[PDB]
Write a protein that binds this ligand. Structure first.
Ligand SMILES: CCCC[C@@]12CCC(=O)C(Br)=C1c1ccc(O)cc1C2
Ligand SMILES: CCCC[C@@]12CCC(=O)C(Br)=C1c1ccc(O)cc1C2
Lengths: 225, 225
């Protein structure tokens, strides 16, 4: 109830944000990168557990959602981290990248998908409160199977609340009702792009390094046991 | 101007809908399927040329948009065609499929992504006017590169108009302002799913039949010359 209310929901999400992850280095890009994800994934699962109502869904649903959405959530965080640095990607404190470093490959393709989309978010002037709500939407909207009898009723309620909070945030800008709808529409259309980049990253990842998708699956098990 | 107005824009789109395509048969599924797309693509390009303002964009933009969005537009049409037939996919008049025919493979995965998403549109009670506006959004939102000096100003104007028409359509249902936003949000979140299915179909398609993506590219050239 209360916890799912716009002002509160948004401040609960703020405290649930994952920490800075240091890669901690003593196929090097891809070595750096896969070790990073392994690290980031642990925190991702913690983050999800702090989203009001998520742990009360079915574990059959929790596991489905985290499995399908991990790369879009790590990419959404990445764009938010690089949003002010045109030309770069800020993967972590000691791991920043130039586009011309994405020349050594296949990675260059993905690199430009993430710079472009990020530039789009810059132009829209993505607010923190907006960022927090969209990343939560990405997790809850990541699959359709899990919302095809109570956990479903629950999943929708919890997804509708987040959409309510975003709408709320936007209404506070003091813009016109038409601007509101145009902004809500521009924001959610951008998720289609996010998913695209995710699909490509996932693709690149099987054509190959650390067992990110393995261990995660493993983390998913312990998460159940 | 006028042509981009909600009631009119929606009736212009109605007359621009492609015809019934008969496959016309005298790797058979995939033979049927690739021949079908070759056929459907010709009409797709005609359809796009009837969307007010599209031919006045740069050809550098026209070609980018059709190239990136062809499979999502053929899948969006497919779901609309099967929306009332649970368990099937209605690819064309003489080409209907059962899920258990999608067992002979890899195609089964995709098959369930398209049944699920379609079921979602059923539950939402997707209206014709709504269908017409979303399919146009899919084409105009298909890439971000082309909207990263006039053709861009133009592209946004033309995408904003379509979003205006959809919003208009939804406001006519006589539902509550909160229902409006929740419905607009539910509709555009579904595009993320559409793109997902597209990405998978595209994937399946290179791992392989008719040169769909070749000839299309070819059609793209003639389209310029
Ligand atoms: C353009 C290269 C992007 C690498 C990105 C996608 C490709 C990949 O294999 C990995 Br493991 C990647 C990754 C790790 C952590 C993170 O937060 C985001 C990503 C995306
Ligand atoms: C589940 C199988 C789907 C086949 C679908 C995606 C896989 C594929 O190779 C082809 Br050519 C396909 C196709 C053709 C026409 C059309 O309107 C839609 C599609 C999607």
């Amino acid at each position: 109830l209360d916890a799912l209310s716009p002002e509160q929901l948004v401040l609960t999400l703020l405290e649930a944000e994952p920490p800075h992850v240091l890669i901690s280095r003593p196929a090097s890009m891809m070595m750096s990168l896969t070790k990073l994800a392994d690290k980031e994934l642990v925190h991702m699962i913690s983050w999800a557990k702090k989203i009001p109502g998520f742990v009360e869904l079915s574990l059959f649903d929790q596991v489905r959602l985290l499995e399908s959405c991990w790369m879009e959530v790590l990419m959404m965080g990445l764009m938010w981290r690089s949003i002010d640095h045109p030309g770069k990607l800020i993967f972590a404190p000691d791991l920043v990248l130039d586009r011309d470093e994405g020349k050594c490959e296949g990675i260059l393709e993905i690199f430009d998908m993430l710079l472009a989309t990020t530039s789009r978010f810059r132009e829209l002037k993505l607010q923190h409160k907006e960022y927090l709500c969209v990343k939560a939407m990405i997790l809850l909207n990541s699959s359709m199977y899990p919302l095809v009898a109570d956990s479903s009723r629950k999943l929708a309620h919890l997804l509708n609340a987040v959409t309510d909070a975003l709408v709320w945030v936007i209404a506070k800008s003091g813009i016109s009702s038409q601007q509101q709808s145009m902004r809500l529409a521009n924001l959610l259309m951008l998720l289609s792009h996010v998913r695209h980049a995710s699909n490509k990253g996932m693709e690149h990842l099987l054509n190959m390094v650390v067992p990110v998708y393995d261990l995660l699956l493993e983390m998913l098990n312990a998460h159940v046991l």
